[PDB]
């Protein structure tokens, strides 16, 4: 196999305790071409940052760097992981609930110089709790800003905050993303906790396309210059160069009905994963598939939201949708935004499932259940969680989530 990323670690915590700083600090050195080190995403404004967890052969300490930060000797590769960072308390929230099938663990960053449970910090623990993500590591950051008295008071606070949650058994590592205090302890913990799960590669392939492009540019060679390319997170089984795949919703056609997407099939030419090209890619990090498809079809990220797999074995496409609605008890925001009024018949909601994003029209009401017609067909497996977001002014606010039921 490859030294590609083996697990997706989510960076969650308040919007200022330092999630983005710690990420860059650990991933900076693993970004060489066409990506200066850090940026947020598409509709799930999700961002993937790779990092190679290594062990210093001389001092025996862990880091995310090739040359031991301390002694200076060469480190050894142990594993490759990928952090999912995202500026925007909402976007992260939406991503987590919707594509919970992407994360394998999460690092809860909680600033030590502020009351433990901050409005936003609660919502993530709330999201992590809803998607059954128990593999959590707590990073009490900015330890250099609180004397040992406050630190212990914070520690305690955190402990009371997590008891009775999925992060109830998570370590509380005091660190300094700024100076690097205990980063070695942390990195090591990512191995102790959040290990690569046992996945049966033989399961039929499924990838959630996060982006689609046309790497073509007036470079002009007309020969075998690459066709359509998709970037996503394999979430089941595996993709292999030379594989015949079936894209999901598909390409639209000329109004017989009004709008209709037909599933399309293509052949995988290339696969980038870990910065290099492989003949076989696996879940963990981002995967860049090369197809024989007309770039004219993937250009501008039109394919984004689709799912890939082997012809025949894919999820069921939907044109309508009923859901087991579960409104959330949100704390971040303003009282108005806060107490969500229940969804209404005819309201236009914003839906998130997998990497697909679409508007839906409430055409029915029941007891903690609703119906919706989709603006864009979405490929989904029943039972999968769908993020539901209502407008509220000019913005879109996440008010809850629904559970895919059959109609």
């Amino acid at each position: 196999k490859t030294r590609q990323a083996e697990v997706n670690i989510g960076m969650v915590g308040h919007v200022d305790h330092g999630k983005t700083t710690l990420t860059k600090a650990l991933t900076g050195v693993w970004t060489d071409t066409h990506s200066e080190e850090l940026r947020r995403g598409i509709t799930i404004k999700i961002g993937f940052a790779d990092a190679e967890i290594r062990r210093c052969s001389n001092c025996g300490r862990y880091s995310t760097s090739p040359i031991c930060p301390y002694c200076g000797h060469e480190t050894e590769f142990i594993r490759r992981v990928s952090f999912i960072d995202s500026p925007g308390h909402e976007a992260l929230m939406t991503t987590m609930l919707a594509g919970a099938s992407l994360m394998d663990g999460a690092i809860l960053v909680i600033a030590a110089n502020e009351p433990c449970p901050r409005p936003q910090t609660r919502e993530h623990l709330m999201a992590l709790q809803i998607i059954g993500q128990k593999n959590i590591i707590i990073a009490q950051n900015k330890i250099e800003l609180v004397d040992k008295e406050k630190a212990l008071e914070n520690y305690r606070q955190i402990k009371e905050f997590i008891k009775g949650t999925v992060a109830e058994n998570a370590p509380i590592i005091p660190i300094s993303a700024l100076h690097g205090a205990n980063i070695d302890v942390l990195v090591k913990a990512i191995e102790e906790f959040i290990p690569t799960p046992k996945r049966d590669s033989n399961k039929p392939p499924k990838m959630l396309v996060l982006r689609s492009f046309d790497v073509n540019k007036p470079g002009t060679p007309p020969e075998k210059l690459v066709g359509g390319v998709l970037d996503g997170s394999i979430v089941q089984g595996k993709l292999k160069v030379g594989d015949e795949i079936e894209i999901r919703p598909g390409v639209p056609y000329e109004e017989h009905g009004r709008i209709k997407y037909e599933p399309i099939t293509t052949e995988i030419v290339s696969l980038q994963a870990g910065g290099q090209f492989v003949e076989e890619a696996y879940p963990g990090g981002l995967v860049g598939i090369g197809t024989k498809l007309d770039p004219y079809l993937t250009k501008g990220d039109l394919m984004a939201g689709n799912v890939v797999g082997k012809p025949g074995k894919l999820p069921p496409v939907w044109t309508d949708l009923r859901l087991e609605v579960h409104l959330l008890e949100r704390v971040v925001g303003t009282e108005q935004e806060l107490n969500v009024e229940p969804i209404k018949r005819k309201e236009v909601l914003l839906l998130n499932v997998g990497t697909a994003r679409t508007m839906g029209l409430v055409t029915a009401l029941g007891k903690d259940e609703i119906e919706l017609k989709l603006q864009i067909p979405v490929c989904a497996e029943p039972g999968e969680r769908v993020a539901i977001s209502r407008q509220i002014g000019s913005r879109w606010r996440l008010i809850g989530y629904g559970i895919i039921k059959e109609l």
Partner: protein, 137 residues
């Protein structure tokens, strides 16, 4: 040391914690490292700030680094270009050492140490206590 013994973890976390910030005598104006790894080169564009905060020369530090590290760099308009790839902490760890053996007085900790030269020998030091440690290490 297990991850559940927060206490030890806390003290382990404060030794790495810098001088100026770690203990009693605190030069406190040292702003942390700002590292940008572009293409195949590391650039700390916050350099001037560091030196000017440590009241040390600009090139006196460019050197201490290329020493503890094995790359080549040039200073320019308050920034520095390093020839390879280096994580913010690698550098973060080297500045820590500089402050320790080139900016602090070992008898009476004082950010007020200064580089002096009274012979071809570099004895540099203290404007507060007067101790003149021989620093080339």
């Amino acid at each position: 040391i297990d991850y559940y013994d927060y206490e030890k973890l806390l003290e382990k976390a404060y030794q790495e914690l810098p001088e100026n910030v770690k203990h009693h005598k605190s030069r406190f104006e040292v702003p942390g490292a700002l590292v940008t790894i572009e293409g195949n080169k590391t650039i700390i564009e916050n350099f001037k700030d560091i030196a000017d905060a440590l009241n040390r020369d600009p090139q006196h530090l460019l050197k201490f680094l290329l020493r503890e590290i094995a790359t080549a760099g040039t200073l320019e308009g308050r920034r520095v270009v390093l020839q390879g790839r280096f994580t913010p902490y690698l550098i973060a760890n080297k500045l820590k050492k500089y402050i320790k053996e080139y900016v602090i007085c070992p008898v009476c900790g004082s950010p007020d140490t200064k580089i002096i030269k009274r012979d071809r020998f570099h004895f540099l030091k203290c404007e507060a206590c007067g101790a003149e440690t021989p620093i080339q290490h």
